[PDB]
Amino acid sequence: NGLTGTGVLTESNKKFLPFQQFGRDIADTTDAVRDPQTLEILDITPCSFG
Amino acid sequence: FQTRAGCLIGAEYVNNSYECDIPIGAGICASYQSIIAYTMSLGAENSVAYSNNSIAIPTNFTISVTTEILPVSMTKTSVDCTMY
């Protein structure tokens, strides 16, 4: 929905309230999203680097 | 091979234990001997013959000369502004 990101998208066990749109924890790190079509919540984590 | 510090490619793990020279991490460390990797050995293990009625009195001596190096000063430099 216009939000650009990169990482692995996996199943999330969070509990968004019905009005919620996404979630972040610290420093504007979008941790969890809900898809605009299925309305199913997923979470994002960056792929490995080292 | 996989270790707590990541993984190693090109080295083969061995079950021995030597006082190593190239640290890797988390106790694991490598040496050339094909390159091999192992767990470092803290040193030779010996059991002193402790009792309640025995001592160990030396009978000879040696004299040793050792070195140690300590820096005391570094080069004195100055820097201008307008020319820089």
Partner: protein
Amino acid sequence: ICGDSTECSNLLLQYGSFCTQLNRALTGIAVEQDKNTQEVFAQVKQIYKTPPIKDFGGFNFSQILPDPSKPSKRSFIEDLLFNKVTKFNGLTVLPPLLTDEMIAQYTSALLAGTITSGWTFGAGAALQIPFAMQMAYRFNGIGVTQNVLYENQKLIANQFNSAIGKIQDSLSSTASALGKLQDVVNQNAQALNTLVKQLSSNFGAISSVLNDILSRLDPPEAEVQIDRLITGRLQSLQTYVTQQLIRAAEIRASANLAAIKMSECVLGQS
């Protein structure tokens, strides 16, 4: 400061070699910490072991000698100390070279050597000697004739055992007895946390996120905004590095003092 972008990397490439210096400094301090602990603890050439039968004239070292039942091979006091002390953005944490198990092994070797041999193993090879006579020598060192010790052996042993038990109880019950290490950990964690949180500052640009500001404007203005963000983040990073350098220097001084104390008070009478 760029976070998976090409324009940001290209713009950063023309500011010189600040990042090489930063990486060199951080690597240097890490290696310094490793060498620091290695020189503090690794003082013995060999690894001694206590004999199976323990009769030290009545003294009781049960609560400081390693317990084979515990998988960690750590004594009671070490377990108490360990129990009394309490993720991906571009930063990493390396593990220490020496695992805590080997540190425990060094500690056990030092303690066994000082119990059996005394100060003799600090100069040449370890020399066996009964513990009571070592304690007699230690009194003779401080101006009290050994004539005392042999007439007060049981009383001295009881006093020492009571003292060690009281120390154990005080550590087990009373809290806030390890303020220094906890404070060090708190300082490091807080500095890292504020460095991470600084990443959300506007710094005078129109946004604090690279992708949104890149997918919204033409390159010519992107140059200006990326420049502002880059300079702000670079300043914050430099401040963090300087603080870390100061803290590392102080910690190194403390570790040097600790090594001196270990060498002078454990391996001999000062």
